[PDB]
């Protein structure tokens, strides 16, 4: 018999005394070791001392593991390790200052959500996604990738949506004092006000502009416009069906070209720091000017009324 550690939470290693005898599935239930599916093995000596991943088998477990992840889904915990799998094989080099992912298995949607984030002011809520964050910034991004994928119930290979995995991704970020309030008119609806506050406080499907917003958007049974009046947060992110779109330097934080169909697509990052950056997995293309397919826009906030 050998001396091991089984965890949920990667913070709390609960010591277990394991039987030789038995495998990992008929101790723990399904277990993993560094990502490797190690239920159905018998233990070696050599693993002795070594930390293994299990699912929440007791209400202490289950308590460790929902005030890790802010989560109950307990295929979570199993597609999490899954993917980790994968992701850990993945290239993480540092491009435009920031951390990219090298081009694997669709990558590209996760890639442009990696680095956008590094440029936003935001700091998320469940511990797991934060603790793998500050890693990722540092370029073992490996653990927060997977996270990713399992938040957003998405496999490896799957093409993605980088506007869907932000909305999924924000639900843990620290929004709590994101405040977006608007004007609504109509000739019949007196002064009627509409405030958003959470993920919807800083996100907006219709136009990249933040201008537009200002400036006044349509609303879909009659005709009624809606002009943003006062917004409080670090950032916000405008969305729009791929258009033909100008990024000038200095009037916007990041954004997000698709090239592409809508059954198949090709995501790319862009950026400005002395020039403008195409940040496209570990490629990178400086340019003076950019005009092309966009999807989304980040812009740098704190507090805007009118």
């Not at 964050?133 to 399992?150: E, K, M, P, V």
């Amino acid at each position: 018999t050998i001396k091991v550690f089984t965890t949920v939470d990667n913070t709390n290693l609960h010591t277990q005394l394991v039987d030789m005898s038995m495998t990992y599935g008929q101790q723990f239930g399904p277990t993993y070791l560094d990502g490797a599916d190690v239920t159905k093995i018998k233990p070696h000596v050599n693993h002795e001392g070594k930390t293994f991943f299990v699912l929440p088998s007791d209400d202490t477990l289950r308590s460790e593991a929902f005030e890790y992840y802010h989560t109950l889904d307990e295929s979570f915990l199993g597609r999490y390790m899954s993917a980790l799998n994968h992701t850990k094989k993945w290239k993480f080099p540092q491009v435009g200052g920031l951390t990219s992912i090298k081009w694997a298995d669709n990558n590209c949607y996760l890639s442009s959500v990696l680095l956008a984030l590094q440029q936003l002011e935001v700091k998320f809520n469940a511990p797991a996604l934060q603790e793998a964050y500050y890693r990722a910034r540092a370029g073992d991004a490996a653990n927060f990738c997977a996270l990713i994928l399992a938040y957003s119930n998405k496999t490896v290979g799957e093409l993605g949506d980088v506007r869907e995995t932000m909305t999924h991704l924000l639900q843990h970020a620290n929004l709590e004092s994101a405040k977006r309030v608007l004007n609504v008119v109509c000739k019949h609806c007196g002064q009627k006000t509409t405030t958003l506050t959470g993920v919807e406080a800083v996100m907006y499907m219709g136009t990249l502009s933040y201008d537009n917003l200002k400036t006044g958007v349509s609303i879909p049974g009659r005709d009624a416009t809606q002009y943003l009046v006062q917004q409080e947060s670090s950032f916000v992110m405008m969305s729009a069906p791929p258009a033909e779109y100008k990024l000038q330097q200095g009037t916007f934080l990041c954004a997000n070209e698709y090239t592409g169909n809508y059954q198949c697509g090709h995501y790319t990052h862009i950026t400005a720091k002395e020039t403008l950056y195409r940040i496209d997995g570990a490629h990178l293309t400086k340019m003076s000017e950019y005009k092309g397919p966009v999807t989304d826009v980040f812009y740098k906030e704190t507090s805007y009324t009118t």
